[PDB]
Design a protein around this nucleic acid. Structure first.
Ligand SMILES: [Mg+2]
Ligand SMILES: [Mg+2]
Length: 746
RNA sequence: UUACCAAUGGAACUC
């Protein structure tokens, strides 16, 4: 029912391939064993002896067995267990009749596609499929790139589709044992610890079997000559096992072993690193070269899928593998109809302007005043000694730009930071703040990529001494040409932090509160995870109430999301004299699995918070946002495939069949191809029309005040993510309650 | 920081 008729139509070409199911039925049977056979493998072989009687075409789970052929008769087959050596009754009885395209059929269809892809000589490294023989060697940075595919049979609304996405995995050419040689040759005191720090948390490939292992430990005491228990019953040396298996000369007796988590031990000689180096990430040149090599234009992606389909077609064995279940792949990718929604109006106080086909307001915001500019009169700039001149320019230009935007700015209070030391930074900032209680902004210039400084400054400002904080690396202000635009963006950010407003969009709905949540899982999960919450407190969706709840093992996060929601509703009651008639919740940071958890556990409890307020039953609309989706769509131009224009919504033929969902591309894509964002509505009590939901979701993407343009997800979710990141990864602490009313996290 | 895009299970084990 999601289909709507707003927006101009367009023809798109997805990275999906339809599968024509040519078989009438796939049946389901249950299996019983008279002497109860606990072992799964033995039951598997037992069914294999009579596989001819049931049929060569089988897919077995242990007690549920799917056959294309109809074994309609409930049958008992006599089998034998070698140890018990007695007759066993395999009783097969049909339990269900299913369509070829049913949901349970999708798993073993995916398994059959696994088999097909294997018969295409493709290597299953991880979940995806890769070909080592097609590797793309890099001679400069010691990198290998493996072309491959990540493919899956799925059932969308239209039917069964093979979603295939091209993927490049970066393997490192040189051995881990060569890295051990490097660290040992460095012969520095106590860098075995640095070697351990490098190895931990980075996945390492075994090329001998093309399997990834996550590094868990390094054993300096253990050696390849050390003993490990075997299935044979005798503990044996790793030398013996590996030499018997492969016979490769283990170069070093001295080399340690990498422990996985019995326990598994790997030689650094026969293991190789995965993932690009962090130094490579910092380097612009290497990253951009690798991106040019990896980045695939829409035409190249379509060509890759066409090549894969042709390769499947030519190999007879793969076609026979798919055909038995009754599946055949069509020759070309699907083509669907999707509509582009009308462009929106951005209303500033003096003027309103319509975005024009680039989806950037950047030039217009600076020229004209914003809605609310909070004057700056008492603020402090803390600057290093060596950077004075650069700092000087920052204020001077900041005055010249300030007029157009509506800010009235006075000269700053200068604080000279005597040296680079962290303790001096903190003490001087605290001294200036204690001396004057009217300091509105703490602006600090930090030198170099000194994140240790930034952490201390933000921790002092956000928690210990509540004051809005702004940090400006000297690198950005140093460049002479770019000073005007940089100053403008800094000035807008200062406007947001002081409590002002930049721009807005016309909101169709009436008495609305757009709650938006996200979760920050730390890179090392062991550390506390965070959930950020941002809710509008004024009707025009320009003022926000931001609160963060930290993950606690003892209490579930719903219990405190309740209190956050109650506080936001009370803030709405006070500021606007009336509670929201409609509350639209955009939930993000939900993996694929927990859509049933959020829909049936979190949301029903979140509604009970309304019980505290007397006889108040607002209308709740809940969306679950996924940005990690694999689907890629392109504009099927008359000429060829082209990058899609902003605002394209697909509500048919790729949406799920148990929810009301849509795929929206709002950001303007400069590079590669456009990857939609998937919105799934788990609760709609408001009976809000599909077109209303799509229009609201598109509108909210225009509100992100850090970027003058449309963004990937609704602004509440991105604000919640910013809050979660700042609270969890930098502060490691809950921010001060007083600062929450403004936008300090930007 | 001027700012958005930019870890474990697989067939009819691995130590
Ligand atoms: Mg987010
Ligand atoms: Mg910021």
């Amino acid at each position: 029912v999601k289909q709507g008729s707003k927006g101009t139509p367009q023809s798109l070409g997805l990275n999906l391939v339809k599968i024509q199911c040519h078989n009438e039925a796939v049946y389901q049977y249950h299996v019983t064993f008279s002497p109860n056979v606990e072992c799964k493998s033995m039951r598997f072989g037992m069914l294999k002896d009579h596989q001819a009687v049931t049929g060569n075409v089988t897919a077995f789970d242990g007690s549920i067995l799917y056959l294309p052929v109809k074994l309609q008769q409930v049958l008992e087959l006599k089998s034998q267990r070698k140890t018990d050596s007695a007759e066993i009754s395999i009783k097969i009885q049909m339990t269900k009749i299913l369509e070829p395209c049913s949901d349970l059929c999708i798993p073993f269809y995916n398994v059959v596609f696994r088999r097909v892809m294997k018969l295409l000589d493709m290597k299953l490294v991880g979940r995806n499929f890769y070909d080592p023989t097609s590797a793309m060697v890099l001679q400069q940075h010691r990198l290998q790139i493996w072309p491959g595919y990540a493919a899956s049979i799925r059932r969308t609304d239209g039917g069964l589709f093979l979603l295939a996405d091209v993927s490049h995995k970066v393997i490192r050419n040189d051995c881990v044992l060569d890295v051990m040689h490097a660290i040992y040759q460095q012969n520095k005191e106590h860098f075995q610890d640095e070697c351990t720090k490098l190895l931990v948390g980075n996945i390492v490939i075994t090329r001998y079997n093309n399997r990834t292992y996550r590094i868990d430990d390094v054993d300096w005491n253990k050696t390849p000559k050390d003993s490990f228990t075997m299935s044979d019953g005798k503990e044996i040396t790793f030398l013996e096992y590996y030499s018997k298996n492969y016979g490769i000369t283990v170069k070093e007796e001295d080399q340690p072993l990498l422990i996985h988590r019995g326990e598994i031990l790997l030689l650094p000689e026969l293991s190789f690193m995965t993932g690009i180096p962090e130094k490579m990430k910092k380097d612009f040149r290497a990253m951009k070269d690798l991106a040019q090599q990896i980045n695939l234009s829409p035409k190249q992606h379509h060509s890759a899928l066409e090549c894969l389909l042709q390769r499947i077609a030519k190999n007879e064995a793969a076609t026979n593998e798919l055909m038995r279940w009754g599946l055949r792949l069509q020759k070309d990718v699907h083509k669907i109809e999707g509509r582009v929604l009308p462009m929106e109006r951005i209303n500033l106080k003096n003027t309103s302007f319509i975005t024009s086909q680039e989806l950037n307001w950047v030039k217009e915001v600076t020229r004209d005043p914003s809605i609310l500019t909070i004057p700056m009169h008492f603020w402090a700039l803390f600057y290093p000694k060596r950077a004075m001149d650069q700092a000087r320019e920052l204020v001077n230009m900041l005055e010249k730009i300030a007029g157009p935007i509506g800010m009235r700015m006075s000269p700053p209070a200068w604080v000279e930071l005597k040296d680079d030391r962290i303790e001096t930074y903190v003490r001087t900032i605290q001294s200036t703040l204690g001396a004057e209680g009217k300091i509105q902004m703490v602006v600090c210039i930090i030198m170099g990529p000194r994140d240790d400084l930034y952490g201390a400054i933000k921790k002092l400002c956000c928690v210990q001494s509540p004051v809005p904080s702004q940090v400006v690396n000297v690198r950005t202000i140093g460049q002479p040409t770019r000073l005007r635009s940089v100053a403008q963006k800094i000035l807008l950010q200062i406007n947001c932090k002081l409590g002002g407003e930049l721009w807005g969009v016309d909101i169709p709905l009436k008495q609305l509160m757009v709650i938006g949540m996200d979760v920050y899982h730390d890179p090392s999960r062991g550390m506390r995870s965070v959930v950020g919450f941002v809710a509008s407190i004024n009707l025009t969706l320009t003022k926000w109430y931001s609160r963060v709840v930290f993950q606690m093992p003892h209490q579930e996060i719903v219990d405190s999301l309740k209190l956050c929601l109650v506080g936001s509703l009370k803030k709405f009651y006070e500021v606007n004299h009336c509670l929201p008639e409609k509350i639209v919740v955009y939930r993000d940071g939900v993996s694929d699995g927990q859509l049933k958890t959020v829909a049936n556990y979190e949301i029903p409890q979140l509604q009970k918070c309304f019980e505290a307020f007397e006889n108040y039953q607002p209308k709740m609309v809940v969306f679950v946002v996924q940005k990690k989706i694999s689907t890629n769509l392109y504009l099927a131009a008359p000429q060829n495939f082209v990058t899609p224009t902003p605002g394209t919504v697909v509500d048919h033929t790729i949406t799920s069949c148990e929810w009301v969902d849509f795929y929206l591309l709002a950001h303007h894509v400069r590079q590669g191809c456009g990857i939609p964002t998937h919105y799934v509505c788990v609760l709609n009590t408001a009976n809000l029309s599909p077109d209303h939901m799509q229009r609201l979701t598109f509108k909210l993407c225009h509100m992100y005040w850090n970027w003058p343009g449309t963004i990937r997800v609704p602004a509440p979710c991105k604000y919640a993510h910013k809050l979660a990141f700042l609270s969890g990864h930098i502060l490691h602490h809950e921010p001060a309650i007083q600062l929450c009313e403004n936008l300090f996290f930007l």
